[PDB]
Ligand binder design. Structure first.
Ligand SMILES: Nc1ncnc2c1ncn2[C@@H]1O[C@H](COP(=O)(O)OP(=O)(O)OP(=O)(O)O)[C@@H](O)[C@H]1O
Ligand SMILES: Nc1ncnc2c1ncn2[C@@H]1O[C@H](COP(=O)(O)OP(=O)(O)OP(=O)(O)O)[C@@H](O)[C@H]1O
Ligand SMILES: Nc1ncnc2c1ncn2[C@@H]1O[C@H](COP(=O)(O)OP(=O)(O)O)[C@@H](O)[C@H]1O
Ligand SMILES: [Mg+2]
Ligand SMILES: [Mg+2]
Ligand SMILES: [Mg+2]
Ligand SMILES: [Mg+2]
Lengths: 388, 63, 366, 247, 151, 219
């Protein structure tokens, strides 16, 4: 609603231009007349104080044991039906003291404890679902840290980050930004790394959900979480929703699923609507990451739902060296290990294997209370990770 | 058509118009709050006021 | 504060004396439901929510005809006397399906579906508007339309557009909302829907993506899907079911037409079937125009040539070409697109992403 | 009937022969098979995966087969397919000898078998042969050779390679311990013993889980031998003593 | 009854408890004296293997479709009180009625009157009885003749 | 006792029931299919025992159970989950119709378009007895079927229904009405007041629902 700050962010002069001065003095004159305008009338008309008298009378009209209940329906204004504490419905009378605006059908209502009526709305406790996927800040991974993938970082920048920092570009050519991005590649290529990189330099509520939690126990509590996921995203202003391992909504079978595949499909048919249905969309951008782009219904990937398909290949030899350097940056090597010699250990190392080598190297140096990794540590590190 | 934004002095030359918005080819309503056009001096109006009666005249370009 | 503090000026407008004038003279009532109208003169049987089933008559001001069996009515909190009839209870999850804001798309952003649009207006946009034309002849206009085609063809757009001009109430349905946990209440949402619609003299229902609750009757001897099947039967029974359906005009679009029960696809329920095929040459040459209007162009662009470079391109794949061709201009830092930019766009959205696609594996409707 | 056809000769959307890939995956569970090439001979060391107090000792080897007077092979994968392919190899070699009155060069034999495998993975509708073969032999053209084959029908000449369980570890170890052009047969046997020791994580070699064969030239005639228990035990003892001395 | 699902539903474990109560009061810690129970079912296979255990339901009668001798006996009872006329032959109906469980045999009688009532006859003959034997047999092919015995 | 009505999707099953509810001065309790199904345990039985007690409490009554599949699916043995909540409602219907009580004043009419799925117990002789078969119109029912629904708008004297009834084969009764209904909407397109034979014939295609396929390289 209204914003307490930012009375007039007219910083267009951005200098000592006199235009800044004229507006400021305007309020000062209005303030002066208001001062004696309120106190003067507050003496010969000592009916309402507006500071202690106003609040006082309403409190008496309220009750000491204020009740809490659920508003069930909105009958004509000044009248509503509110569900009592346990199981009863009362045709209460709405009092004007309430804002009369936050009366959503089912949020909350405060009622007098004897003549039950509407006395006031109650803000709804942050539902546990919102807190579950409300990623605050990406801990450490920056955007120059990712390294390697270069032509693939421009697509994500140009779909989920540019339209929020420089909208003019998709503002003068009359082109709406590409709807979504789907990331696909072998197991371990930076798919999620780039996914959390965008969360770093972003100004929107990031939400993350893995494909495995989209499949639930009871029937119907399937394509109902999908509705909740996109209901939270809309309520939270600009937001990037990240679905990870989307290939778990029909690639993995779980006994907890009361309904079998037939139930999982209806989850997809609800996810299909939530990405492109005849409802309004607003500002919500979907990033889907998967390691098997060939095992999902070719309608979830239809242009319009997800537009830009980004392909993540196994690291190139030149990029392999960059991966080692970034991961080994904060490591006191023993000027005896050569990075180039370990670049060729197996025909194709994902890159997540590179970090595994550089992380097991340290654990192989801790065992000897040594703060310098030698070629022996890496040699045994390169065998304990990608061999067994 | 769109709201009016003033850039009398800004650190960067931001475009005068926020977005093109609607650009329906068919005849449609024109909003009162008009602003400056784009760049390249293409189809630039002569009236410069948008008094609801501005007339457009074609010119010779790139013969 | 932080609970209900409203504009303080409005509180005095609330006339606290009147509020006191209303917080005492106005007795608060309790909701109830009538079960019987025991004859003799009054003697109404009542059923409060969770207290008991008392016997009540009236107060003074409710006309006997104002009250009928199974009608929501408020009652006194002390002597239990009916005071005011109350509206019937509609499930909140079913009452949220009514569209309150018209989608911002009209019958001029769909191109190539000239025949489809015309056939979709004599069953949902002419029986209601100008309803006297058919009276001067014996014609019950067809009630119901099925829109089917490959994904990304325009099934929803032609439906989202109809809601932009329709005068009657428009009711959403997704086809997955009608799936609920417990047996039973998946047909309640399909019984309440029509009860709400019948309360509106003109009403339209758009059963979008009717494949999760519109399957074929299948008995495997192993208790296959049954709750969804039961829900479909209720939908089938509420369109022609020994009770005049009313003025409800259904409109359901399915991505998989070859999966529906051979009872939801007969005249009477889903009367007319409209086919949404891939646009032809004249078509996709028009889709390009409707999506490349509000963008900078070289003016002299061979849009027909671009149309013929993507023969079996759905409507969506054409917007992605337009929305991507200008993308190649944002990267070069230019501000005016070019044909070579579009050609590179077609090479990426039509021939480079054709590995995944959806058209090749859906035109068989399987 | 179309419904029951498994369609074993199709291209996957990413251009991969799925049946061939799965057959290769099957080989990973077979026994470890190792081959080292020396300046004076070639050797094959194989893991005797079958180990039981009730199995009887029959034949001259369990996985090392003889194909000609100057060739031998070792099989990893499905045993029945190995038998079929060994019979085909023997027939091909005898046909070549009958036609030309000279022993078949190793490259020709591996090429013929790989042609059979390719035919099976291209047309026919049958499942591919799930077996990889290691070949060793001598010919008048290139001397001692060591070859490898895969279900896909691809073969390559190698100086030291391993197929079967823990093949990658064996290949890495050989890459670090192989001195090209400066290896005698004794050093090759020692290296093979080390590789088998480290690759078979299950306890240490017992001289009953290893089948070592040698190919050497003597008096103008090729000699193919299968090492006995005594020499294998001696190699194990020497390796253990060398490891102890190092530490 | 039922088979006591594992991984059942919310309002299906409750019916399970009721079975576990009817089950325990049959043969439990307090033997029930001089109270005998008779149970019937058309599908004695879905029953839990605790209700069928000897001790709770000891004897398991197997009322079956009538045999050739029985089939004749069935007809007399329901075909008795009929305003017949002529040598109504009950032997003819029995041979042509195989699988007629216990009601279509009575349906045969009632249907026969329906044919007789048509033509305004207070007059039932053998042909009407035969004319109803086929009309009932035709309407029996759409059943699913399954045995479904206990185990 | 009882009259089951089965047949293809649309043949006239509910028309006879609705018609039989007009030429009869008796209570016509109108059940449904999905409707006796309720979430709570035993709520389905209430609506079946109460739906028959009410009919008995009143004069001669006919209780019509349309769409019997939803409450008459074949019983099904299984472990690890299943569906017996709906089965009890059917089991209460079975005993209420004919069990431990020879009720003889409430007549039951049932409608179904899939008899293969019904429980064998529901197709006895004591329960629904006269199992009528409703077949598709053959070659003359399609002539009367159109004249019934076409005698309200307009018809030129030269409109040969016989040929119309012949070009429409494998058409169920409901589709036949759509021919007459669509014969008008397509006469309204070309502004006129009289239906003509080429309007019926042209409208037959629209109801056949066959996609355009450029069927012009044949012959
Ligand atoms: N190209 C790369 N550049 C930098 N780090 C990489 C790269 N590829 C993988 N990594 C590292 O791999 C580690 C573990 O795998 P990672 O999270 O990157 O997987 P992923 O590529 O997102 O795959 P998946 O979708 O299978 O989870 C990460 O912490 C990341 O730093
Ligand atoms: N004929 C058309 N003209 C213009 N745009 C079109 C056309 N057909 C489809 N589109 C585009 O398709 C997008 C939306 O597709 P829509 O959801 O309507 O397709 P659909 O095939 O009915 O969907 P689905 O099967 O996924 O429910 C919009 O961006 C719209 O511009
Ligand atoms: N013989 C007929 N004469 C006229 N109309 C018929 C005939 N048979 C079916 N219909 C049409 O079918 C519709 C009723 O369909 P119905 O047979 O009740 O469906 P279901 O068989 O699924 O219950 C009615 O609108 C009616 O006009
Ligand atoms: Mg990942
Ligand atoms: Mg849709
Ligand atoms: Mg039809
Ligand atoms: Mg018990």
């Amino acid at each position: 609603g209204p914003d307490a700050a930012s009375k007039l962010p007219l910083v267009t002069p951005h200098t000592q231009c006199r235009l800044k001065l004229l507006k400021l003095e305007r309020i000062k004159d209005y303030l002066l007349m208001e001062e004696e305008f309120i106190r003067n009338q507050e003496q010969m008309k000592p009916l309402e104080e507006k500071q202690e008298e106003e609040r006082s009378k309403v409190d008496d009209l309220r009750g000491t044991p204020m009740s809490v209940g659920t508003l069930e329906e909105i009958i004509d204004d000044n009248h509503a039906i509110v569900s009592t504490s346990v199981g009863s419905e009362h045709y209460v009378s709405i009092l004007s003291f309430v804002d009369k605006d936050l009366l959503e059908p089912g949020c909350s209502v405060l009622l007098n404890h004897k003549v039950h009526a509407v006395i006031g709305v109650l803000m709804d406790d942050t539902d546990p679902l919102v807190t579950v996927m409300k990623v605050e800040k990406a801990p450490q991974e920056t955007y120059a840290d990712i390294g390697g993938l270069d032509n693939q970082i421009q697509e994500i920048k140009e779909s989920v980050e540019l339209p929020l920092t420089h909208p003019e570009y998709y503002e003068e050519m009359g082109i709406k930004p590409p709807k979504g991005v789907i990331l696909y590649g072998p197991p371990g290529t930076g798919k999620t790394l780039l996914a959390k990189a965008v969360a770093n330099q972003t100004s929107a509520t990031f939400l993350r959900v893995v494909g495995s939690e989209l499949i639930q126990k009871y029937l119907g509590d399937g394509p109902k979480l999908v509705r909740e996921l996109f209901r939270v995203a809309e309520e939270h202003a600009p937001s990037i929703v990240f679905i990870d391992e989307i290939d778990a909504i029909g690639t993995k079978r779980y006994d907890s699923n009361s309904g079998g595949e037939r139930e999982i499909q209806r989850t997809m048919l609800e996810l299909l609507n939530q990405l492109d249905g005849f409802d309004s969309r607003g500002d919500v951008k979907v990033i889907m990451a998967t390691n098997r782009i060939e095992t999902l219904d070719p309608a979830l990937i239809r242009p319009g739902r997800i537009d830009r398909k980004i392909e993540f290949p196994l690291p190139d030899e030149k990029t392999k060296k960059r991966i080692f350097q970034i991961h080994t940056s904060r490591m006191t090597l023993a000027d005896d290990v050569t990075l180039d010699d370990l670049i060729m250990a197996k025909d194709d190392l994902s890159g997540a294997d590179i970090k595994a080598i550089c992380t097991e190297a340290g654990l192989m140096a801790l065992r000897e209370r040594r703060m310098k990794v030698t070629n022996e540590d890496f040699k045994k590190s390169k065998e304990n990770v990608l061999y067994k | 058509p769109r709201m009016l934004v003033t850039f009398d002095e800004e650190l960067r030359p931001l475009p005068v118009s926020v977005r093109v918005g609607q650009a329906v080819d068919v005849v449609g309503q024109a909003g009162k709050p008009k602003t400056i056009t784009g760049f390249q001096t293409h189809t630039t109006p002569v009236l410069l006021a948008h008094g609801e009666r501005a007339e457009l005249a074609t010119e010779e370009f790139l013969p | 504060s932080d609970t209900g503090l409203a504009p303080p000026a409005l509180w005095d407008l609330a006339a606290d004396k009147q509020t006191l004038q209303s917080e005492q003279p106005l007795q608060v009532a309790r909701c109830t439901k009538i079960i019987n109208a025991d004859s003799e003169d009054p003697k109404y049987i009542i059923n409060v929510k969770q207290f008991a089933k008392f016997v009540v008559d009236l107060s003074d001001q409710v006309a006997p005809t104002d009250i009928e069996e199974g009608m929501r009515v408020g009652v006194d909190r002390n002597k239990y006397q009916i005071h005011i009839p109350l509206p019937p209870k509609i499930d909140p999850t079913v009452t949220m399906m009514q569209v309150e804001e018209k989608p911002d798309v009209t019958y001029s952003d769909v191109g190539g579906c000239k025949e489809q649009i015309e056939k979709l207006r004599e069953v949902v946009e002419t029986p209601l508007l100008h309803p006297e034309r058919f009276v001067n002849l014996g014609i019950e206009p067809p009630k119901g339309v099925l829109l089917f085609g490959p994904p990304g063809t325009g099934k929803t757009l032609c439906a989202r557009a109809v809601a932009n001009r329709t005068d009657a109430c428009f009711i959403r349905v997704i086809g997955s909302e009608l799936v609920q946990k417990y047996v039973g209440e998946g047909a309640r949402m399909v019984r309440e829907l029509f009860e709400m619609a019948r309360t509106k003299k003109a009403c339209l229902i758009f059963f979008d993506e009717i494949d999760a609750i519109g399957g074929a009757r299948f008995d495997d001897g192993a208790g296959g899907d049954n709750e969804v099947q039961r829900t479909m039967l209720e939908l089938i029974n509420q369109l022609d079911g020994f009770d005049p359906r009313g003025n409800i005009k259904v409109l359901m679009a399915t991505n998989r037409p070859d999966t529906l029960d051979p009872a939801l696809m007969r005249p009477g329920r889903l009367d007319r079937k409209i086919e949404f095929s891939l646009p032809d040459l004249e078509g996709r040459t028009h889709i390009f125009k409707i999506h490349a209007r509000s963008m900078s162009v070289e003016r002299d662009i061979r849009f027909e040539l671009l149309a013929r470079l993507c023969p079996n391109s759905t409507g969506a794949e054409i917007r992605s070409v337009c929305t991507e061709a200008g993308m190649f201009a944002i990267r070069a830092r230019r501000k005016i697109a070019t044909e070579k930019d579009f050609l590179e766009a077609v090479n990426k959205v039509i021939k480079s992403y054709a590995k995944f696609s959806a058209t090749p594996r859906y035109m068989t409707y399987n | 009937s179309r419904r029951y056809d498994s369609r074993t000769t199709i291209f996957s959307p990413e251009g991969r022969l799925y049946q061939v890939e799965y057959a290769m995956e099957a080989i990973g569970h077979a026994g470890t098979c190792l081959g080292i090439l020396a300046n004076d001979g070639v050797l094959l060391a194989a893991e005797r995966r079958n180990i039981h107090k009730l199995l009887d000792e029959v034949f001259f080897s369990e996985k090392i087969y003889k194909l000609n007077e100057d060739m031998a092979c070792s099989v990893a994968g499905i045993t029945s397919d190995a038998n079929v392919l060994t019979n085909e190899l023997r027939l091909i070699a005898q046909r070549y000898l009958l036609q030309y009155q000279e022993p078949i060069p190793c490259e020709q034999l591996v090429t013929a078998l790989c042609d059979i495998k390719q035919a099976y993975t291209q047309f026919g509708g049958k499942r591919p042969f799930g077996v990889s073969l290691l070949y060793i032999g001598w010919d008048k053209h290139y001397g001692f050779q060591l070859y490898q084959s895969d279900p896909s029908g691809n073969y390559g000449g190698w100086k030291a390679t391993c197929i079967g369980n823990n093949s990658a570890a064996a290949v890495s170890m050989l890459k670090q311990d192989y001195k090209e052009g400066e290896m005698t047969l004794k050093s090759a046997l020692a290296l093979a013993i080390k590789v088998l020791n480290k690759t078979m994580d299950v306890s240490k070699l017992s001289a009953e889980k290893v089948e070592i064969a040698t190919l050497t030239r003597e008096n103008g005639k090729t000699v193919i031998r299968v090492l006995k228990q005594k020499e294998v035990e001696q190699l194990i003892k020497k390796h253990e003593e060398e490891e102890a001395k190092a530490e | 009854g039922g088979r006591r699902f594992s991984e059942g539903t919310s309002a299906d474990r409750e019916i399970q408890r009721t079975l576990m109560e009817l089950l325990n009061q049959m043969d439990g810690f307090d033997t029930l004296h001089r109270v005998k129970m008779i149970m019937a079912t058309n599908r004695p296979d879905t029953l839990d293997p605790a209700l069928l255990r000897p001790g709770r339901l000891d004897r398991k009668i197997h009322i079956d479709l009538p045999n050739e001798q029985a089939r004749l006996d069935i007809l007399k009872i329901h075909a008795g009180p009929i305003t017949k006329h002529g040598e109504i032959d009950y032997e003819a109906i029995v041979k042509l009625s195989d699988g007629f469980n216990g009601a279509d045999l009575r349906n045969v009688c009632t249907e026969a009157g329906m044919f007789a009532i048509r033509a305004d006859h207070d007059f039932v003959v053998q042909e009407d009885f035969m004319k109803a034997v086929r009309k009932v047999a035709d309407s029996k092919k759409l059943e699913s003749k399954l045995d479904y015995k206990p185990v | 006792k009882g009259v089951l009505m089965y047949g293809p999707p649309g043949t006239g099953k509910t028309l006879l029931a609705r018609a039989c509810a007009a030429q009869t001065k008796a209570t016509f309790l109108k059940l449904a299919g999905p409707q006796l199904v309720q979430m709570f345990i035993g709520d389905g039985a209430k609506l079946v025992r109460d739906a028959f007690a009410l009919a008995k409490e009143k004069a001669p009554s006919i209780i019509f159970i349309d769409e019997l599949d939803a409450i008459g699916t074949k019983r099904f043995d299984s472990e690890k989950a299943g569906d017996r909540e709906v089965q009890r409602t059917m089991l209460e219907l079975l005993n209420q119709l004919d069990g431990f009580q020879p009720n003889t004043q409430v007549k039951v009419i049932a409608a179904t378009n899939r008899v293969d799925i019904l429980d064998p117990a529901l197709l006895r002789s004591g329960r629904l007895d006269r199992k009528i078969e409703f077949p598709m119109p053959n070659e003359e029912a399609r002539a009367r079927i159109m004249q019934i629904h076409s005698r309200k708008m307009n018809v030129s004297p030269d409109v040969n229904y016989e040929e119309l009834a012949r070009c429409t084969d494998d058409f169920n009764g409901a589709q036949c009405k759509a021919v007459c209904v669509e014969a008008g909407m397509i006469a309204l397109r070309r502004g006129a007041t009289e239906l003509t034979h080429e309007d019926y014939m042209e409208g037959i295609l629209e109801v056949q629902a066959k996609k355009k396929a450029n069927l012009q390289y044949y012959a």
